[PDB]
């Protein structure tokens, strides 16, 4: 998270921290709980083995509130396009159901097929790097503004407004950054977006997967 502040501990109990095994190394992503047994994240966070931490604030400390659960299944969207980062959405089935409490509980998904008006304020949270030089051990968050589609159409060659959201005023140095992939974009406490991609420099605007575009597939896969 660039330009944000540390979250109040356990204020975002749906946040998930993913440790991912890749063929050549390890990756780290965010995600969010949408049901006691399912985490929503980005498809480019896929890997052979995924350990999920819920209930965390400082992921480098082993707080009593954390629940560590492996992913039994990691279901990438069937039309995920690695090259263009299109349909960048993945559901993780947890190998057991989480135990619900004040620190671990799922976040609401959008009502039907909602658009998102430019100028809307939305919050993103994550454990990603804060700049080119350092990261964070604790959850951070920042409030961003939905952009008119032209801001990303001029900057990103494969941005599709039907299935993606353009987020972040250029003038402010506020954005999600490396490690924040898969984290939620929350607008009035509903998860409307998934951190996907941006410029290598982290300067806004950036592109989020538009969750409402995938509601039928998400509901079918969980059922």
């Amino acid at each position: 998270i660039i330009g944000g502040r540390e979250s109040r501990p356990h204020s975002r109990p749906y946040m998930a921290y993913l440790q991912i095994q890749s063929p050549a190394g390890q990756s780290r992503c965010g995600g969010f709980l949408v049901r006691e047994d399912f985490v929503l994240t980005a498809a480019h966070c896929w890997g052979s083995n995924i350990n999920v931490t819920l209930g965390a604030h400082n992921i480098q400390r082993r707080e009593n509130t954390q629940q560590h659960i492996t992913a039994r299944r990691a279901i990438r969207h069937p039309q995920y396009n690695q090259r263009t980062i299109q349909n960048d959405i993945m559901l993780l089935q947890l190998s057991r159901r989480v135990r619900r409490n004040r620190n671990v509980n799922p976040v609401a998904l959008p009502r039907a097929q909602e658009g998102l008006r430019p100028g809307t304020l939305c919050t993103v949270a994550g454990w990603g790097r804060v700049s080119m030089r350092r990261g964070t051990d604790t959850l951070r968050e920042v409030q961003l503004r939905v952009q008119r589609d032209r801001q990303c159409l001029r900057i990103f060659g494969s941005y599709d407004p039907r299935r993606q959201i353009c987020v972040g005023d250029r003038r402010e140095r506020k954005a999600a950054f490396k490690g924040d992939s898969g984290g939620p974009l929350l607008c009035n406490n509903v998860a409307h977006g998934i951190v996907s991609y941006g410029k290598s420099s982290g300067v806004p605007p950036e592109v989020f997967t538009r969750v409402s575009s995938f509601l039928p597939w998400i509901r079918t896969t969980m059922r």
Binding site: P23, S27, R129, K178, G179, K199
Partner: protein, 97 residues
Amino acid sequence: TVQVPYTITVNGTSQNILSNLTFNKNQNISYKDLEGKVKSVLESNRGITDVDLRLSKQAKYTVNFKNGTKKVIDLKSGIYTANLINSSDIKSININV
């Protein structure tokens, strides 16, 4: 037994994932092998193959060293730099296609 972060930008876009390559601690490796790792993560993260690198306008990766220097390496070139590189000297790798 050390992790080296890398980033990938392709056609102006960069996934917001925090990604690392695994290296053996304090091992001298060749730039042929380092290129192999680079090409491996280009394929597995972004589906970029060798023909795609040939036809891109530019394709390079930058090795950032712990001592603040950097080496910029061309993936469209042959002729490996006459040398080996130590694993524990690398701060990070930025791949740009």
